[PDB]
Amino acid sequence: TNKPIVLSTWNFGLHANVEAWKVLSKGGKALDAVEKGVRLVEDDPTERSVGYGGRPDRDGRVTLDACIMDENYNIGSVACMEHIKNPISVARAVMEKTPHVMLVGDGALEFALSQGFKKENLLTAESEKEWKEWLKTS
């Protein structure tokens, strides 16, 4: 068997894989590995497709979607969450600290903050500008 091994989407997935490997190569759990990896792209404002720096909706709001799944069918997810940079961690929090598996909208942020997650402005001046530019045509 080829283990340990990690797979991630797109070119930026290469650098994200390195953060996951740090956990895998040391014999860490896959759950902690896949979390630390995608989080790297969440904190990166140059990657406007994930978390911080992500392009907003038509209203100019940056809503994030994320879900996690371990090796024993334990799942966690959050959809349409605002102000939280790392939704992947909130999803895990919902998985471990909640009797539910999926939270959305305000209920997601509320729970998130209640867990110690900070509120931040995920809309970068660069994404806000590209947005306004789009508003013109549509």
Binding site: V6, S8, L14, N17, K29, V34, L64, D65, I68, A79
Partner: protein, 143 residues
């Protein structure tokens, strides 16, 4: 969007999918990334899969769950990813849509550490890190 799946030294699988959704989408629009069976699904007894791209089509066919179930039937990771995107292209045509405005990618891995991927349009790559190293591969190749 970044989907990640892995198999640790214990032989356990896990996945992670996070995204900011389609740019300039309707306020409360939700894609496949937060849905289990759509943007991500893991079964330690078979394998794991995660997707990217136009989530609407992934939610539509519950892609990831399909990819894993296919691997369950005996298909290789790449074969499962291939068959899943095929079912998507079929439904796209059936609904009278143009595959040109659609891009869906799948990456899969099984219990033996075997991996593979596939997509609809050229341009999607995936990163694979194992004991041999960290590299970028083009879906549809190898196997």
């Amino acid at each position: 969007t970044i989907g990640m799946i892995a198999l640790d030294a214990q032989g356990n699988l896990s996945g992670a999918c996070t995204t900011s959704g389609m740019a300039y989408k309707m306020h409360g629009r939700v894609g496949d990334s937060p849905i289990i069976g759509a943007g991500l699904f893991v079964d330690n007894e078979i394998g794991a899969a995660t997707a990217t791209g136009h989530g609407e089509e992934v939610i539509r066919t519950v892609g990831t769950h399909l990819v894993v179930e296919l691997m369950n039937q005996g298909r290789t990771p790449q074969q499962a990813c291939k068959e899943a995107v095929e079912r998507i292209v079929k439904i796209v045509n059936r609904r009278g849509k143009n595959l040109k405005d659609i891009q869906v990618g799948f990456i899969a891995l099984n219990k033996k550490g075997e991996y593979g991927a596939y997509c609809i349009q050229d341009g999607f790559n995936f990163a694979v890190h194992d004991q041999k190293g960290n590299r970028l591969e083009t879906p549809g190749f190898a196997l």
